[PDB]
Symmetry: C3
Subunit: 346 residues, 3 copies
Amino acid sequence: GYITGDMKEFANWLKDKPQALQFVDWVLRGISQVVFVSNPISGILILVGLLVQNPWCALNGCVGTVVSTLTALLLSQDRSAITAGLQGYNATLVGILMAIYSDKGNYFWWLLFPVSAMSMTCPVFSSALNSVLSKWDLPVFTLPFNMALSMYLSATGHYNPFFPSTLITPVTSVPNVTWPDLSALQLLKSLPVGVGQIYGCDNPWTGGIFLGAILLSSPLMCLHAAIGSLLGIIAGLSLSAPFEDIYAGLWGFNSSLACIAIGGTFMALTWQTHLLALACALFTAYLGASMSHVMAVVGLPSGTWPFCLATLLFLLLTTKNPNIYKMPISKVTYPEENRIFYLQSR
Amino acid sequence: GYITGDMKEFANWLKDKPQALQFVDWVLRGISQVVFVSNPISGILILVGLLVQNPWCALNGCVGTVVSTLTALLLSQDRSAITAGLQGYNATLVGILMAIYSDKGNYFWWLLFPVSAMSMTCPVFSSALNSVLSKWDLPVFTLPFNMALSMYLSATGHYNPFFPSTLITPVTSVPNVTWPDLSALQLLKSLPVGVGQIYGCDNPWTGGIFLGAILLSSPLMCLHAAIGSLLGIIAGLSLSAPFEDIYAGLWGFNSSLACIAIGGTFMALTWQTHLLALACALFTAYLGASMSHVMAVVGLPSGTWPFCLATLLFLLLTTKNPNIYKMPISKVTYPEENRIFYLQSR
Amino acid sequence: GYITGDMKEFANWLKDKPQALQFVDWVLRGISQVVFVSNPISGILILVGLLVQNPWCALNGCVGTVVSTLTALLLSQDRSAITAGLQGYNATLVGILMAIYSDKGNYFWWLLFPVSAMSMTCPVFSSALNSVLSKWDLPVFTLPFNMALSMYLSATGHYNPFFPSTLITPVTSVPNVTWPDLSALQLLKSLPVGVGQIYGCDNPWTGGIFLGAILLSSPLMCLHAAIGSLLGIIAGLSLSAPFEDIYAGLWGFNSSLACIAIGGTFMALTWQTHLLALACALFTAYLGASMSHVMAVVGLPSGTWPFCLATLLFLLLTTKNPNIYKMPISKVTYPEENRIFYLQS
Ligand SMILES: CCCCCCCCCCCCC/C=C\[C@@H](O)[C@H](CO)NC(=O)CCCCCCC
Ligand SMILES: CCCCCCCCCCCCC/C=C\[C@@H](O)[C@H](CO)NC(=O)CCCCCCC
Ligand SMILES: CCCCCCCCCCCCC/C=C\[C@@H](O)[C@H](CO)NC(=O)CCCCCCC
Ligand SMILES: CCCCCCCCO[C@@H]1O[C@H](CO)[C@@H](O)[C@H](O)[C@H]1O
Ligand SMILES: CCCCCCCCO[C@@H]1O[C@H](CO)[C@@H](O)[C@H](O)[C@H]1O
Ligand SMILES: CCCCCCCCO[C@@H]1O[C@H](CO)[C@@H](O)[C@H](O)[C@H]1O
Ligand SMILES: CCCCCCCCO[C@@H]1O[C@H](CO)[C@@H](O)[C@H](O)[C@H]1O
Ligand SMILES: CCCCCCCCO[C@@H]1O[C@H](CO)[C@@H](O)[C@H](O)[C@H]1O
Ligand SMILES: CCCCCCCCO[C@@H]1O[C@H](CO)[C@@H](O)[C@H](O)[C@H]1O
Ligand SMILES: CCCCCCCCO[C@@H]1O[C@H](CO)[C@@H](O)[C@H](O)[C@H]1O
Ligand SMILES: CCCCCCCCO[C@@H]1O[C@H](CO)[C@@H](O)[C@H](O)[C@H]1O
Ligand SMILES: CCCCCCCCO[C@@H]1O[C@H](CO)[C@@H](O)[C@H](O)[C@H]1O
Ligand SMILES: CCCCCCCCO[C@@H]1O[C@H](CO)[C@@H](O)[C@H](O)[C@H]1O
Ligand SMILES: OC[C@H]1O[C@@H](O)[C@H](O)[C@@H](O)[C@@H]1O
Ligand SMILES: OC[C@H]1O[C@@H](O)[C@H](O)[C@@H](O)[C@@H]1O
Ligand SMILES: OC[C@H]1O[C@@H](O)[C@H](O)[C@@H](O)[C@@H]1O
Ligand SMILES: OC[C@H]1O[C@@H](O)[C@H](O)[C@@H](O)[C@@H]1O
Ligand SMILES: OC[C@H]1O[C@@H](O)[C@H](O)[C@@H](O)[C@@H]1O
Ligand SMILES: OC[C@H]1O[C@@H](O)[C@H](O)[C@@H](O)[C@@H]1O
Ligand SMILES: OC[C@H]1O[C@@H](O)[C@H](O)[C@@H](O)[C@@H]1O
Ligand SMILES: OC[C@H]1O[C@@H](O)[C@H](O)[C@@H](O)[C@@H]1O
């Protein structure tokens, strides 16, 4: 039970100890914060998943986390945020997806320059976005990652002579979809691939491993991760998306994140907020189609912009239903503990 | 008499009456709230106009209004707002323009699935936008409609195999405009067609009906709806827009809305405030051009985004002219009643 | 010293004097407010710069400045802001860049109609944007200009029969860049050309004049203008931009504005804050490429949107370091005097 949730005991114990280990704690908590987890073991496990996918991306992820963390220290950011990993997770993503969307292949070592540079912007985006969003008691989610990646990918683009990005072009014809070819086996693989694509990973073992890491911290988060991935799959089929897009988990990652967020993490989990999480996840998946189409016209991927905009929208919803309750940000940990706080004062 | 303005007395009467009839009334107010009117008779007249245009569009509007009203109830939204029609007007438009912008033409029954889905969205957009805009005492206008429409039409796009939208492409050459051919009687028809296009109707008779539906509530609103359409035409000629576009009322619907909003509804009506409505109306017509061009690159229509942004812009204007007064949201009804509050304390 | 900084002695003296001479003053201070300077001599110097570049662009600038200042008066806007020149600078840019981005060339007199119209929007954009941004004590910078320009240029486009804009298309192939041809002298000349490009002037003399106009008001502002422009050049090189783009100052004008803003104008000037301006200026140049690439898709230029977004982004940054201090809007003048307030608060 010491390796579960928050790992609040371990961190209080670490407070006494060498700073380099304390730092490694933060980097690991930073990696896990992508899926709203603050748990170093979960972090190590996720690293394994990233290494199984592609050690090059894993490395670019780690450089990101470390560089961003150093930068928050440099700029005197809130230390409680840094120890929770809140200053590492955006750049984890920036490092990984900068490598995914690079046209130069694995171990193009120069990539480490712009990865380090874009990772330094992550605490600047976070603080600035917090100055606005904390006024409505909202989180910044991965807006810093998504701004950083959109900025970097459009600044370079596919024709940059140093750091060309992969070419992305809008849909320009009706895809032929032959429904008798739809495959149960591939759809089932799509569920964990959807969770894997939260870190831009299409290996179903990696998504399997990520589900494992979440389970360790909070089974309620694990459940909503899987359900959101499923609802994304359903949304894709409902709009007749090419099957291979659904198979590659492209319909599932934004949905999965949205479902975790609303399903107990930033809303207290009741039956009502569980239904709300199902709605948000479907909504998020459709916004993903929308953002993908539109950002393809300017040669950009959607990233997790859909998850960010969808979820902020649902958190801004007010209701006279007392069973739908927004967590105070200063109180957000994980669903099982969140629900206790809510039950105490309802 | 009792069928004028806001029908306060009929509203007070209905409160004891059957649930089903009160619901009919919320829906009809929902319909009229597109033009800032809360009047069930105006609602009936507008509905007649929609049936004169295209009964398919009328049906989708009505479904939209009903689903949204029901979703606001399901989500325990504010009753005053529901009864006033404020939870139906966005989805009225969502239904109509999803039909207007469908490439599958009339009585494509499948369209009822995404219309309902997107109508369920409108209370969530309204509530989230309120949480932000109410902090400046601003209304959401048709931002929920325009967000839903934009999301829907880019998520599907012209190449969706299930729900293709109408193809929209950017301007790629100088249009040839033959000035001698300009028809005076055609510009005169453009005025009521501009008003018809508020509900995506290009039939001049339907335009006049809407003008009449508005008249019944408020003559001042009617006058500004007409002036706004006119100014749009003038802006269109000033930029050498193709005649066919002016004639189909595409330069007049946003203008018309902006003019009504500023000309007595959201600003107290004075002559200074009347001049401000004219300026806003012109500015809106021009922002319409801008948004149309830019959104066309991604295959989207402007919708009423230009009305929403311009009017919000003009409502955030501050002045040390005491005759330019912004109405408290809580005191906004229609220009004749608004004006009494201004005379009392300004 | 009477023609230094804010020229607040002259301003007080002018108060008693004929309304029209005062007006010329506000107009001249409108011109210099593009670079956050409130100084009529600076404004005249900058005006001379514009004439050196292209008198037709100079004319459209002044017309914009006048129409906007008049519109601010008409709409009963704050007098304080009008006499400081905060109601003329956005339309100065509006006018200049509407001429630069017109496909019709010099002395196309009809251009004066939409220049005037778009200049009247500038006080409206300013007031509306203030109503939002003043809640975080943020200034509007040149968002009114950039909104008005983006609206105008996209409402017309390259294929408007009356007012075609210049055709802008996105990059569609890898540029060929010959590194042995790189010229130190041209790169050195790009520094003042970058400052020139703040008012859309590619003439290195003009940009040299602009640096002089700034220096007259504030040497610290002049220094950061030069530094901001330089870091723009480094950014361009770091992404292998075509040399001619670097040479024409296209990587330096956003950078330069950001570096002046953060380097003592909107942030108190310190060690840390200087470093922060270097960081902001680099970031801003990268955002310039991003915004130019993306906006070219819809046929629009970046204007100074990058400067506006980056600088607002860095002023929304909070820190537990007391040497990184944000100036209250009501106390902002120029670095030299801003620093006094800082040491005294
Ligand atoms: C409220 C008052 C305070 C105002 C403060 C302003 C905040 C400043 C943020 C500036 C950072 C912008 C950089 C992000 C993305 C861009 O790089 C690109 C270029 O347009 N985006 C893209 O082309 C794609 C991104 C589209 C996603 C939608 C954005 C909502
Ligand atoms: C101040 C703090 C509040 C922050 C809260 C965030 C609010 C969340 C709402 C976001 C939902 C967006 C859905 C709307 C439109 C999209 O489908 C796409 C986005 O590319 N629109 C388009 O493709 C075109 C849209 C262009 C319209 C002009 C832009 C205003
Ligand atoms: C907090 C609530 C207050 C709400 C206030 C509403 C403010 C309304 C402002 C709307 C005026 C827009 C005019 C400017 C640019 C447009 O012409 C077009 C949009 O398609 N430009 C472009 O497409 C290019 C512009 C892109 C720049 C990126 C924006 C960060
Ligand atoms: C953040 C600083 C990290 C600097 C590492 C960059 C070193 C350059 O690395 C180079 O990358 C090329 C591309 O794959 C290889 O072909 C070369 O062999 C390699 O030396
Ligand atoms: C931050 C500044 C560092 C810039 C690093 C320069 C990267 C050079 O990258 C080079 O790009 C060429 C394509 O044009 C390839 O042919 C070379 O193999 C590759 O090394
Ligand atoms: C929840 C989403 C709906 C699931 C649709 C299931 C359609 C699967 O279809 C099945 O695919 C198998 C491939 O493994 C084939 O062997 C079967 O013949 C076929 O019936
Ligand atoms: C979970 C939602 C699943 C949506 C139902 C998918 C079944 C669609 O049905 C398909 O329609 C196509 C027309 O585009 C035809 O070409 C196919 O033959 C037909 O089977
Ligand atoms: C909620 C999910 C509902 C999706 C089902 C919609 C199926 C679309 O229906 C199909 O549309 C095709 C083109 O639009 C037509 O060619 C076919 O006749 C029709 O089967
Ligand atoms: C509201 C203001 C509208 C101004 C429209 C004026 C249009 C006439 O203007 C002129 O018309 C000629 C055609 O006879 C063309 O040859 C010219 O190119 C055109 O400038
Ligand atoms: C405020 C509205 C007035 C509009 C002014 C219209 C000016 C038209 O200008 C005309 O444009 C044509 C190009 O299409 C050219 O053939 C003409 O030479 C040119 O004078
Ligand atoms: C900003 C720092 C980048 C390095 C700039 C120097 C690179 C230019 O290169 C220099 O250009 C000169 C032209 O004036 C030539 O005479 C020199 O031979 C050449 O070395
Ligand atoms: C900081 C003050 C700015 C210095 C400006 C340097 C002006 C160099 O300007 C140069 O002058 C040459 C001869 O006149 C011309 O042939 C070149 O085209 C021009 O670039
Ligand atoms: C501020 C950082 C400046 C970066 C300078 C880039 C150094 C140019 O590096 C160039 O890379 C080319 C690949 O495109 C090679 O073909 C050339 O031989 C090499 O000179
Ligand atoms: O780990 C370091 C090495 O990994 C290899 O797979 C790459 O091909 C080499 O370029 C690199 O130096
Ligand atoms: O893509 C559809 C294809 O799938 C196969 O399973 C069928 O037997 C082919 O005849 C068909 O063309
Ligand atoms: O607590 C979970 C349960 O809550 C009840 O209120 C619902 O009616 C059930 O459908 C649900 O399974
Ligand atoms: O309800 C109206 C009817 O109109 C007809 O023209 C359509 O073809 C039918 O499908 C529809 O039921
Ligand atoms: O065109 C719409 C289609 O919708 C379906 O719901 C109906 O069953 C079909 O008869 C019709 O062809
Ligand atoms: O009683 C009417 C009063 O209302 C105030 O809010 C105004 O600013 C006063 O000048 C005016 O006399
Ligand atoms: O200053 C305005 C005038 O400048 C002259 O030198 C040109 O010949 C004219 O075409 C222009 O209208
Ligand atoms: O450049 C076109 C210009 O021609 C002149 O002869 C007219 O007097 C100007 O108003 C007109 O705009």
